[PDB]
């Protein structure tokens, strides 16, 4: 579920940033939060750690990196 939902949205958002594999924090947050309304699986661990990464200032996030990070920090 979450992989597919995240990815499906990610492709569309990432298209704005040209490379469908690459998204950034700004969109990332929206994309994560979406799993809230969708599956009640957005605005928790995922966004919390991504806010930390935002404060560190990662900014740019590839799908793969994103995906592995969110599930690894959650589990």
User: Which residues are annotated as part of the binding site?
Assistant: 22, 27, 54, 56, 58, 60, 65
Which residues are documented as binding site for Ca(2+)? 22, 27, 54, 56, 58, 60, 65
Tell me the Ramachandran region of residue 52: left when phi exceeds 0, alpha when psi lies from -120 to 50, beta otherwise: alpha
Q: Which helix (H) or strand (E) holds 58?
A: none
3-state secondary structure of 22: strand
């Amino acid at each position: 579920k979450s992989p597919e939902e995240l990815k499906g949205i990610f492709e569309k958002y990432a298209a704005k940033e040209g490379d469908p594999n690459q998204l950034s924090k700004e969109e990332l947050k929206l994309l994560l939060q979406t799993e809230g309304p969708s599956l009640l699986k957005g605005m928790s661990t995922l966004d919390e750690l991504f806010e930390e990464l935002d404060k560190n200032g990662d900014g740019e996030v590839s799908f793969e990196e994103f995906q592995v990070l969110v599930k690894k920090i959650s589990q």
